[PDB]
C-alpha cells in the first residue's frame, strides 16, 4: 500500500493545479489516513510534506508562525539523498516559496535546479506549471525575452486542456505585461481584457481586480491617468469587497494609484492615498512595499533626493531593477517638469544604469 499513497499524492497535486479546493481537501484527508498505516518511506514522507506545502500555497492564494513556515521547516530537515522527480518537486516548490518572499535570486536558483530535471516530467500540465512560474519570475526581473519564451510554452499546454482557466488568465497577465515592458500598451490591452472576461465568468474577485490593475497600467503607460486612476480605484474595491484587503499585492494597486493621483496634480487626494498605502505596508509587514511608498512620499512631497537615492540602492540590492528604473524614471520626469534639470539629469542617468543592469 506504498504505491497507493504515491498515486493519491499525485491525484492530490492534480487537483491543486485545478484549484479544486474540495477535491484537494478530500485527497489530503485520504493521504493522511493512509500514511497512518504505512511503513515510513522517508521519500514518501517527503513527497507528502511537499504536497502539504504546495496545498498550503494554493490555499494562501485563495484566502490570505504561519502553517507555511512550520511546513517549510519539515521540508528542509529532510533534503538528504534526493533523486528523480522528487528532487524536481523539491526545488520547484522551494523556488515558489522563495518567490513569494521577494527572494528573487534564491527562487531563480531553485528554479534553475528544477529545470535541469525537466526531462523527467512526463505530465505536460506539470511542465506548463514550471514554464509559467519561470516565465513569471523572468517578467519580474524584466527578462522579457526569456519570459516570453517560457510563457508561450505554458499557455499552449494550458489552452490544450480545459479546466485550467485560472492558469490561462495568469498566463494572459504575463504575456500582456511583457508587451507592456516593450512599450506596446495597445498590444497588451487585448490580453488583459480577455483575462478580465474569463475572471468574471468564474467569479474570481482576485483575478478580476488584478486585471483592472494590469489594464490601469496600460492607461498609465498611455498617459491616460484619468482612465488609469479609475481602473486602479475599482480594482482596489474589488480586493476590498471580497476578502483580499490584506493581500500584499493590493499594495501594487495602491502604489500606482498614489503615483497617478500625484501626476494628475490632485495633491491632496494624492496624500490621502500614499497614506493608506504607507500604513498598510507597515501593517502587512512588507518592507519592500513600504519603501516604495516612501519613495513616492519623499519625491512628490519632500524632494528628499537623498532618501530617494537610498531607496534606489535598496531596491537594487533586492534585485528589483525594474522598480529601480520605474521610480528613478518618476523622479527624473517630475524634476524635469519642475525645471530642476540639473538633478533631473541625475535620475535620468540612474534610469540608464538600471536599464543596462537589466540587460546583462
Amino acid at each position: 500500500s506504498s504505491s497507493k499513497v504515491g498515486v493519491k499524492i499525485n491525484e492530490w497535486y492534480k487537483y491543486i493545479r485545478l484549484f479544486s479546493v474540495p477535491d484537494s481537501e478530500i485527497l489530503k484527508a485520504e493521504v493522511e489516513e493512509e500514511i497512518r498505516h504505512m511503513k515510513e518511506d522517508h521519500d514518501l514522507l517527503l513527497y507528502y510534506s511537499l504536497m502539504c506545502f504546495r496545498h498550503q500555497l494554493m490555499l494562501d492564494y485563495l484566502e490570505p508562525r504561519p502553517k507555511i513556515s512550520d511546513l517549510l521547516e519539515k521540508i528542509e530537515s529532510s533534503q538528504t539523498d534526493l533523486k528523480g522527480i522528487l528532487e524536481y518537486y523539491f526545488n520547484f516548490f522551494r523556488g515558489m516559496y522563495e518567490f513569494e518572499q521577494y527572494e528573487y535570486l534564491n527562487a531563480i536558483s531553485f528554479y534553475k535546479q528544477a529545470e535541469r530535471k525537466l526531462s523527467l516530467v512526463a505530465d505536460e500540465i506539470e511542465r506548463a506549471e514550471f514554464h509559467y512560474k519561470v516565465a513569471e519570475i523572468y517578467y519580474h526581473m524584466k527578462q522579457t525575452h526569456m519570459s516570453m519564451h517560457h510563457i508561450v510554452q505554458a499557455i499552449d499546454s494550458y489552452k490544450a486542456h480545459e479546466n485550467y482557466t485560472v492558469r490561462v488568465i495568469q498566463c494572459s497577465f504575463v504575456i500582456g505585461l511583457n508587451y507592456l515592458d516593450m512599450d506596446y500598451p495597445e498590444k497588451a490591452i487585448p490580453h488583459f481584457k480577455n483575462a478580465l472576461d474569463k475572471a468574471r465568468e468564474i467569479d474570481m474577485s482576485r483575478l478580476i481586480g488584478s486585471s483592472l490593475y494590469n489594464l490601469g497600467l496600460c492607461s498609465f503607460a498611455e498617459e491616460a491617468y484619468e482612465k488609469a486612476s479609475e481602473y486602479f480605484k475599482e480594482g482596489i474595491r474589488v480586493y476590498q469587497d471580497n476578502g483580499y484587503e490584506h493581500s500584499n499585492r493590493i499594495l501594487d494597486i495602491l502604489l500606482m494609484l498614489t503615483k497617478t493621483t500625484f501626476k494628475m496634480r490632485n495633491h491632496s487626494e494624492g496624500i490621502s492615498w500614499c497614506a493608506h498605502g504607507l500604513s498598510l505596508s507597515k501593517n502587512l509587514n512588507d518592507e519592500i512595499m513600504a519603501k516604495m511608498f516612501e519613495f513616492i512620499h519623499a519625491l512628490y512631497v519632500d524632494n528628499d533626493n537623498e532618501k530617494l537615492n537610498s531607496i534606489l540602492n535598496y531596491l537594487e540590492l533586492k534585485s528589483m531593477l525594474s522598480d529601480v528604473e520605474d521610480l528613478a524614471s518618476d523622479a527624473a520626469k517630475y524634476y524635469n517638469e519642475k525645471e530642476d534639470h540639473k538633478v533631473a539629469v541625475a535620475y535620468y542617468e540612474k534610469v540608464l544604469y538600471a536599464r543596462k543592469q537589466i540587460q546583462r
Binding site: 492564494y61 513569471e136 517578467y139 519580474h140 495568469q170 497577465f173 504575463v174 500582456g176 505585461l177 507592456l180 488584478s210 490593475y213 494590469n214 497600467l217 499585492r249 501594487d252 502604489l255 500606482m256 516604495m292 525594474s322 522598480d323 520605474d326
Partner: peptide
C-alpha cells in the same frame, strides 16, 4: 510597479 502575474 510590476504588473500582477498571479
Amino acid at each position: 510597479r510590476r504588473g500582477h502575474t498571479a
